[PDB]
Amino acid sequence: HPVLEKLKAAHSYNPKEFEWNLKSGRVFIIKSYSEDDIHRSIKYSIWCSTEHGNKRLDSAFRCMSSKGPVYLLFSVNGSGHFCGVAEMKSPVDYGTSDKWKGKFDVQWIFVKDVPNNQLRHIRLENNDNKPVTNSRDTQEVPLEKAKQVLKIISSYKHTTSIFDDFAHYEKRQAVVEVVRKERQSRNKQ
């Protein structure tokens, strides 16, 4: 599969060393609606949250302007694992450019399944001491606990990725586009 080979050659997924001991920065949970959205995000380096989520992330990125990075810890709802880590790279663009209303740039860094039981011992004092694995979308992670999460995700010797199913997602999306196009045609009549 050529798209995945292009993506892996052009970007440096799952670096073997990663500075997790962040001197500055902000870290947030991302809860995706689906694997398809993750696949689309890795392929096109974009993300979109809800309206509320986008406002929070836009504000954080703009407040971090030159001081340090904004990291996104991805997990699809009800999945039982995190699927990767990406860096936020731009503010939110609301201009007209069809399922996502805004968008911002991300750089996917880790694409690897890290099970939730590797992280449940880390709790968020700013979210009623619940496990970081029980977070809502765009929940901010305090820097020290974020260091621990990034260290575990960075080091974890994973068995699978969403990449293991790349062709599957490529086909799903392709079939969807045909389905949409023909349906749209039946409604043009």
Swiss-Prot record:
Domain of life per record: Eukaryota
Record PTM: Ubiquitinated by the CUL7-FBXW8 E3 ligase complex leading to degradation. Deubiquitinated and stabilized by USP5 by removing 'Lys-11'-linked polyubiquitination.
Cell compartment(s), UniProt: Cytoplasm; Cytoplasm, P-body; Cytoplasm, Stress granule
Domain YTH: 25-153
Protein's job: Specifically recognizes and binds N6-methyladenosine (m6A)-containing mRNAs, and regulates their stability. M6A is a modification present at internal sites of mRNAs and some non-coding RNAs and plays a role in mRNA stability and processing. Acts as a regulator of mRNA stability by promoting degradation of m6A-containing mRNAs via interaction with the CCR4-NOT complex. The YTHDF paralogs (YTHDF1, YTHDF2 and YTHDF3) shares m6A-containing mRNAs targets and act redundantly to mediate mRNA degradation and cellular differentiation.
Self-association state and partner proteins as the record states: Interacts with CNOT1; promoting recruitment of the CCR4-NOT complex. Interacts with ribosomes. Interacts with eIF3 (EIF3A or EIF3B). Interacts with YTHDF3.
Entry similarity comment: Belongs to the YTHDF family. YTHDF1 subfamily.
Domain-level remarks: The disordered regions have the ability to interact with each other and to 'phase separate' into liquid droplets within the cytosol following binding to mRNAs containing multiple m6A-modified residues. This leads to the partition of m6A-containing mRNAs into membraneless compartments, where mRNAs may be stored, degraded or used to transport mRNAs to dendritic arbors in neurons.
Annotated protein name in UniProt: YTH domain-containing family protein 1
Organism: Homo sapiens (Human)
Full-protein residues shown: 365 to 559 of 559
